[PDB]
Amino acid sequence: GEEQVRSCHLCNASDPKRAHPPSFLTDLNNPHNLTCWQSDSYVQYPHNVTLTLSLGKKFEVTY
Amino acid sequence: PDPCYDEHGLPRRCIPDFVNSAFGKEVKVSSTCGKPPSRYCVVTEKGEEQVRSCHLCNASDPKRAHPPSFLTDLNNPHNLTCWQSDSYVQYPHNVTLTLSLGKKFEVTYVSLQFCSPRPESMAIYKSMDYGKTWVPFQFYSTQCRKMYNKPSRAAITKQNEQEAICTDSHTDVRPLSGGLIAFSTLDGRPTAHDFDNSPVLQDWVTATDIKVTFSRRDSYFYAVSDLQVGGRCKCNGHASRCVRDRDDNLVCDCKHNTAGPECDRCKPFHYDRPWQRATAREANECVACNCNLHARRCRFNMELYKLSGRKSGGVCLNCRHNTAGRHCHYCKEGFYRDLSKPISHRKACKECDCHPVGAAGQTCNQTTGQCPCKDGVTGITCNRCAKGYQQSRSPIAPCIKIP
Amino acid sequence: ACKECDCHPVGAAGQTCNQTTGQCPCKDGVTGITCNRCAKGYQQSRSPIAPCIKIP
Ligand SMILES: *[C@@H]1O[C@H](CO)[C@@H](O[C@@H]2O[C@H](CO)[C@@H](O[C@@H]3O[C@H](CO[C@H]4O[C@H](CO)[C@@H](O)[C@H](O)[C@@H]4O)[C@@H](O)[C@H](O[C@H]4O[C@H](CO)[C@@H](O)[C@H](O)[C@@H]4O)[C@@H]3O)[C@H](O)[C@H]2NC(C)=O)[C@H](O)[C@H]1NC(C)=O
Ligand SMILES: *[C@@H]1O[C@H](CO)[C@@H](O[C@@H]2O[C@H](CO)[C@@H](O[C@@H]3O[C@H](CO[C@H]4O[C@H](CO)[C@@H](O)[C@H](O)[C@@H]4O)[C@@H](O)[C@H](O[C@H]4O[C@H](CO)[C@@H](O)[C@H](O)[C@@H]4O)[C@@H]3O)[C@H](O)[C@H]2NC(C)=O)[C@H](O)[C@H]1NC(C)=O
Ligand SMILES: *[C@@H]1O[C@H](CO)[C@@H](O[C@@H]2O[C@H](CO)[C@@H](O)[C@H](O)[C@H]2NC(C)=O)[C@H](O)[C@H]1NC(C)=O
Ligand SMILES: *[C@@H]1O[C@H](CO)[C@@H](O[C@@H]2O[C@H](CO)[C@@H](O)[C@H](O)[C@H]2NC(C)=O)[C@H](O)[C@H]1NC(C)=O
Ligand SMILES: *[C@@H]1O[C@H](CO)[C@@H](O)[C@H](O)[C@H]1NC(C)=O
Ligand SMILES: *[C@@H]1O[C@H](CO)[C@@H](O)[C@H](O)[C@H]1NC(C)=O
Ligand SMILES: *[C@@H]1O[C@H](CO)[C@@H](O)[C@H](O)[C@H]1NC(C)=O
Ligand SMILES: *[C@@H]1O[C@H](CO)[C@@H](O)[C@H](O)[C@H]1NC(C)=O
Numbered sequence: 001g002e003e004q005v006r007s008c009h010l011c012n013a014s015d016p017k018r019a020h021p022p023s024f025l026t027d028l029n030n031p032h033n034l035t036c037w038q039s040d041s042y043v044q045y046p047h048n049v050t051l052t053l054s055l056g057k058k059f060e061v062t063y
Numbered sequence: 064p065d066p067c068y069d070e071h072g073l074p075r076r077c078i079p080d081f082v083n084s085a086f087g088k089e090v091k092v093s094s095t096c097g098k099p100p101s102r103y104c105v106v107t108e109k110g111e112e113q114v115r116s117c118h119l120c121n122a123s124d125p126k127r128a129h130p131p132s133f134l135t136d137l138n139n140p141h142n143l144t145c146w147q148s149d150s151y152v153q154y155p156h157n158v159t160l161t162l163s164l165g166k167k168f169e170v171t172y173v174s175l176q177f178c179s180p181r182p183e184s185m186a187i188y189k190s191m192d193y194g195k196t197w198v199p200f201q202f203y204s205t206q207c208r209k210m211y212n213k214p215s216r217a218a219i220t221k222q223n224e225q226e227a228i229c230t231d232s233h234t235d236v237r238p239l240s241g242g243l244i245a246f247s248t249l250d251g252r253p254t255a256h257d258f259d260n261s262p263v264l265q266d267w268v269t270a271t272d273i274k275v276t277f278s279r280r281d282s283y284f285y286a287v288s289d290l291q292v293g294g295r296c297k298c299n300g301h302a303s304r305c306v307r308d309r310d311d312n313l314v315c316d317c318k319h320n321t322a323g324p325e326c327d328r329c330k331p332f333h334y335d336r337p338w339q340r341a342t343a344r345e346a347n348e349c350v351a352c353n354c355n356l357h358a359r360r361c362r363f364n365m366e367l368y369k370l371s372g373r374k375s376g377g378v379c380l381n382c383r384h385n386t387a388g389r390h391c392h393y394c395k396e397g398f399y400r401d402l403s404k405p406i407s408h409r410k411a412c413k414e415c416d417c418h419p420v421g422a423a424g425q426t427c428n429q430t431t432g433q434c435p436c437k438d439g440v441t442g443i444t445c446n447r448c449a450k451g452y453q454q455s456r457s458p459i460a461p462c463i464k465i466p
Numbered sequence: 467a468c469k470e471c472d473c474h475p476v477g478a479a480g481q482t483c484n485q486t487t488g489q490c491p492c493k494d495g496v497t498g499i500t501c502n503r504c505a506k507g508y509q510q511s512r513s514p515i516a517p518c519i520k521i522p
Binding site: 357358381382383384385386391409410 | 470472473474475476480481
Binding site for chain 1: 406
């Protein structure tokens with residue numbers, strides 16, 4: 001409405017349903033069962049925030 | 064699974080189901096026929112007048128034995144189990160039977176089944192201790208006064224709903240045999256509907272041990288076929304059942320972070336909000352202390368919880384990992400906060416690695432780790448030279464101005 | 467086989483245990499491996515700096 005409210009949760013990768021793998025980024029995106037991958041916290045500039053993935057085929061990209 | 068947790072694994076009140084209590088246990092008594100072997104005669108009504116039968120009592124005769132197990136065994140309404148007392152006895156004399164339980168309970172039903180006629184004067188007792196202290200509960204007589212100095216069918220004042228009443232009701236015979244006595248303490252109590260918020264009634268139901276003492280040509284005696292009393296194991300709504308101990312001791316498996324065999328207190332290291340009873344509105348649970356993974360023992364003060372707007376009052380003791388505070392939540396004198404590390408990192412505290420020369424003091428901003436920068440030096444550990452400031456090999460002053 | 471150091475948060479003068487002996491930094495009258503107990507002739511005190519002190 002007008003003010004703030006903060007919830008809170010936890011992450012065990014060994015907990016499948018409580019894990020947040022990058023597969024949450026590659027899986028089908030349900031607007032009703034979204035798949036939130038999660039980063040580590042307490043992080044900011046100045047630091048490299050790098051994620052990697054190679055292709056194996058050259059492409060032209062639009063979207 | 065566990066009724067202590069909702070469909071969403073939310074801690075909710077979990078309670079043992081309502082069960083009969085006085086079923087199958089042994090009782091030490093003060094009198095019984097048959098030692099030496101005793102006899103007894105029995106009267107019956109026929110049409111309009113009377114007729115008297117008669118029998119014998121040897122406990123060494125199993126078929127002529129009638130143990131108190133006959134009160135606790137299953138009583139078949141077609142195969143009754145009547146225990147019998149000695150005869151030729153009456154007021155003034157204690158006809159006392161005891162039962163020491165060891166656990167405090169809340170009771171709803173107290174049912175009875177008689178093989179002897181209903182006498183006139185008697186009362187109720189209990190022990191919220193383990194067979195040492197004894198307090199009455201109610202009286203029962205036509206002359207509650209001449210016998211017990213009591214009124215018959217007194218009123219239950221709201222200001223003391225823990226009154227002990229006496230009545231002549233159902234002190235009549237018929238019923239001689241098969242007397243049915245059921246007692247609900249909740250009768251008459253105005254604050255019985257909201258029992259969840261009736262602690263005095265939640266205290267009036269508290270009972271651990273039970274004692275029953277009686278006052279009030281022919282052989283007259285007393286006999287009874289069975290006993291049933293319903294209740295639920297008192298875990299304050301914090302355990303759905305009660306189990307045996309490794310040393311044979313029935314205790315609640317106190318859930319909801321509660322302690323004591325009855326869930327009466329909070330668990331060790333659970334001192335932030337006071338101990339409370341699970342309500343239909345809120346399970347008013349206990350809560351451990353917050354140390355952010357930096358302590359194992361804690362204490363509490365109400366004023367902390369008081370001034371918290373009644374929200375929290377926990378405080379940790381002996382904050383490890385170079386941490387400190389009520390939540391063991393800051394680095395002591397000597398480190399700084401490694402802000403890069405998470406807020407609960409066990410090594411979030413590290414020595415003020417201040418440039419032992421370039422920093423002016425031996426400390427650093429516990430938040431920033433900003434070491435004490437000397438005259439023209441800046442930087443957290445104070446190492447760098449400034450614009451127009453040339454570093455010198457002097458172990459005292461490196462950066463030097465430009466003309 | 468390896469568990470994090472459990473140095474007595476007060477009675478040990480550090481949070482690092484003697485990885486061989488696990489002996490935390492026991493301060494003058496503090497004893498115990500994690501440096502928690504006070505020694506015989508040292509009673510626990512509520513002072514946040516001197517927990518264990520000799521007696522005259
Ligand atoms: C990561 O996220 C997951 C998912 O939420 C959490 O899951 C935990 O998983 C562990 C798995 O070990 C669970 O531990 C459970 O408790 C047992 C306690 O020891 C008893 O073991 C058996 C009964 O299981 C008894 O006969 C015995 O006498 C002990 O009394 C563990 O021993 C069990 O795990 C054991 O099983 C595996 C095989 O399945 C064996 O290889 C091992 O020996 C292993 O010890 C048992 O599964 C625990 O219940 C789960 N916690 C939950 C669901 O909250 C993790 O907790 C979480 N990790 C972190 C660090 O948060
Ligand atoms: C309290 O209640 C009990 C149980 O009902 C009654 O117990 C009595 O129990 C005894 C058995 O202990 C019964 O006695 C029976 O009668 C025999 C009579 O003596 C003859 O014995 C044999 C045949 O049995 C002959 O060869 C012999 O020549 C005698 O003529 C007893 O001898 C028997 O008891 C023997 O058996 C037990 C084991 O069962 C042994 O340990 C003993 O040696 C014992 O002698 C036989 O069993 C008797 O019937 C019961 N009395 C009854 C039912 O009234 C008590 O009597 C009762 N109390 C009172 C005061 O009545
Ligand atoms: C953070 O910054 C860059 C990537 O964003 C990395 O660059 C390094 O640069 C130094 C300077 O010569 C090289 O010696 C290193 O080999 C480089 N690292 C590489 C190429 O991986 C730097 O390493 C990053 N630091 C991290 C990721 O911890
Ligand atoms: C009969 O009355 C009560 C129980 O109904 C018993 O109370 C006794 O009171 C005297 C008074 O000093 C004490 O010395 C006794 O120790 C009490 N007896 C107990 C506590 O068992 C009295 O003893 C009863 N008489 C009996 C059982 O023979
Ligand atoms: C989303 O999908 C997962 C797939 O296992 C399922 O477990 C979960 O219940 C789904 N979400 C909801 C709200 O049902
Ligand atoms: C009642 O139960 C006892 C238990 O053994 C049995 O001996 C007796 O025959 C039963 N009586 C009837 C009428 O069923
Ligand atoms: C630490 O740095 C902050 C950053 O501005 C400063 O405000 C504060 O006074 C410094 N000292 C502390 C927090 O003790
Ligand atoms: C660990 O304990 C031993 C036992 O005497 C001691 O000699 C040593 O100095 C301690 N510290 C170490 C090994 O760092």
